[PDB]
């Protein structure tokens, strides 16, 4: 039987039984080409700029080339998200890491990066300069391009496992939920993460361990420190005192 | 509404029921029963697993069948409707055929699949009867209200583990409007509606609830939990000294 | 090069390199900025609206689904209708209010018109707090509101760190849920809006914020209701012990 509003009737009333009837890569290898006309420094000056940029994209319906982003963020297709946008820059900058001039010019350019410098990310290898491009991305979208999958896995159980130290606010953004989207899409596309795979992960992992990052509530808390507790006092709550070095 | 006469609402210092529903839901039984028993079970059940499509249908067209209409586009006419259907499939689990072919055929349906409910006797295929239900407005009709109150608090308890968004379903408040119901009734908490209430309750612990999330989070579970352990993930923890 | 919509295009199509300059890190959020813009716009309506705005708030918070709701000038869009824009969704224009109602605690018409109405908030009752003085109905304002986003707000820097201490040391008695409101994220969040700002806590901002922490210790906070939660509750809590809570 369909579902169709004169069908509900029926089943409300009567006594007979009734039942009823029931991408990227894709969007990526036919518009990836048309990300390539930027300039490398533009690319990063999206990615730097992301918020203020899609600030002014989603107030009207804007057109750049032939290419067509509609006034509202409507249900995402496949010739319309921003996200996608912003992905296919992230891909196409991760390309250009093993391009030895252009890796030159990534890592120089996208350590005054906001996030990069928040997260304390130590760009030295092309390995570092890919997790600075990858890092406020969409990690699902990324995901599902191919060799993308390790690098959106592992950055995912790092935003996962200290997001206290990188102000995620998790009402803001759900990280084991994004963790759970970008595992659907790898089992999605059929990937098995061989000895080789778990390898070229274990780098990027390397990567991410060593950084220091610089934030930033607990660290401002602190300052403030030798007074706050003299209003925990004053509720009945005694803030232990902070060591000494040894020394 | 309007959003216009919200702002003359706030300019006249004024505010924008619960204890009122269990009332109002027992009339809409009253009236509505008898068109909601004339349904077959197979019926009933296709409402309950499609309910949101059905939902959506509706909602933007004014929709009458039999006795009910129901408005368009918050109306809890259809929430009661929902929770009527919900409660006659219950009181079909008398019926050892109706039980059968109910529990046959919810098995099928996908919260049931979410919550990974086992089900088995009676008081099993009742609490997959009322997965996805208005708790407060179930909890208003007698013999409901211990079912109603431990799956709130089961939706509380493991609300991660069932996928469930505090955005979307607050899952204390929902606890708090069927206690509210309860109280309104004078309803006790007797012993033995307590241990109804705890057969109930045993069922819903031997539960297997995956998130239709990405079980994928565990079909990688070894290798993510390599990744875990490098920035300080892992296992348990102490006491040591008790032993 | 600067940021118009069509450097964007530029920056998108045309393969010269390209950045932005006009609030040289096209600036993201500062409510500080956002408040100084819209303070008269907020205090052209009547103390009453916005008192009430504060006391249905959660009502308005379910009424931004519906539809958008505008106050004053400040239209807040519905929630997937529109992006995430500098909205800011209800804690911007919420926090605002209170701005504008603290703003109006000088002179005392409006003083204790504030006391008479705002006794009433059930947090108000919640908290248990007094309103003897004008600092203690300025803490009444601030109960329950996004104490980062006010904190940059010049001068509500101790009132907004002392809440948000006392929020944290007493979040049982107050009922509140950390898997909802990470009582000591939001503390470490107003800290860092202060020292971004290199504010000083002096002598004298000390000696504000202990008249502020003075109102608060002699508050009784009532963690309950209603009598069905509670009624029913020695029986409920038998239940959860077979989830395995607590």
């Given at each position: 039987?369909?579902?169709?509003?004169?069908?509900?009737?029926?089943?409300?009333?009567?006594?007979?039984?009734l039942?009823?009837?029931?991408?990227?890569?894709?969007?990526?290898?036919?518009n990836?080409d048309?990300?390539?006309?930027?300039?490398?420094?533009?690319?990063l000056?999206?990615?730097?700029?992301?918020?203020?940029?899609?600030?002014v994209i989603?107030?009207?319906?804007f057109?750049?080339?032939?290419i067509?982003?509609?006034?509202t963020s409507?249900?995402?297709?496949?010739?319309?998200?921003?996200?996608?946008?912003?992905?296919?820059?992230?891909?196409?900058?991760?390309?250009?890491?093993?391009?030895?001039?252009?890796?030159?010019?990534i890592?120089?350019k996208?350590?005054?990066?906001?996030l990069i410098?928040?997260?304390?990310?130590?760009?030295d290898?092309?390995?570092?300069?890919?997790?600075a491009?990858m890092?406020?991305?969409?990690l699902?979208?990324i995901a599902?391009?191919?060799?993308?999958?390790?690098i959106?896995?592992?950055?995912?159980?790092?935003q996962?496992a200290?997001?206290?130290?990188?102000?995620i606010?998790?009402?803001?953004?759900d990280?084991?939920?994004?963790?759970?989207?970008?595992?659907?899409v790898?089992?999605?596309?059929?990937?098995?993460?061989?000895?080789?795979?778990?390898?070229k992960?274990?780098?990027?992992?390397?990567i991410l361990?060593s950084?220091?990052?610089?934030?930033?509530?607990?660290?401002?808390?602190?300052?403030?420190?030798?007074?706050?507790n003299?209003?925990?006092?004053?509720?009945?709550?005694?803030?232990?005192?902070?060591?000494?070095?040894?020394?």
């Open positions: 039987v369909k579902l169709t509003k004169e069908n509900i009737v029926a089943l409300l009333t009567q006594g007979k039984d039942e009823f009837e029931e991408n990227f890569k894709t969007f990526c290898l036919e990836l048309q990300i390539k006309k930027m300039s490398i420094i533009s690319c000056t999206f990615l730097k700029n992301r918020q203020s940029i899609m600030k989603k107030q009207s319906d057109t750049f080339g032939k067509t982003i509609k006034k409507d249900r995402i297709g496949a010739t319309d998200t921003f996200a996608a946008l912003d992905s296919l820059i992230r891909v196409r900058l991760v390309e250009e890491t093993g391009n030895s001039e252009n890796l030159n010019t890592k120089s996208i350590a005054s990066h906001p410098q928040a997260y304390g990310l130590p760009l290898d092309a390995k570092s300069v890919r997790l491009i890092l406020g991305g969409s699902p979208l599902s391009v191919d060799s993308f999958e390790m959106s896995v592992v950055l995912a159980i790092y996962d200290k997001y206290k130290d990188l102000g606010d998790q009402k803001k953004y990280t084991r939920e994004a963790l759970g989207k970008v595992c659907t790898l089992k999605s596309k059929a990937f098995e993460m061989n000895e080789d795979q778990v390898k992960g274990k780098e990027y992992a390397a361990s950084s220091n990052p610089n934030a930033k509530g607990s660290i401002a808390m602190e300052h403030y420190s030798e007074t706050l003299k209003f925990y006092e004053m509720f009945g709550v005694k803030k232990q005192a902070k060591l000494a070095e040894l020394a």
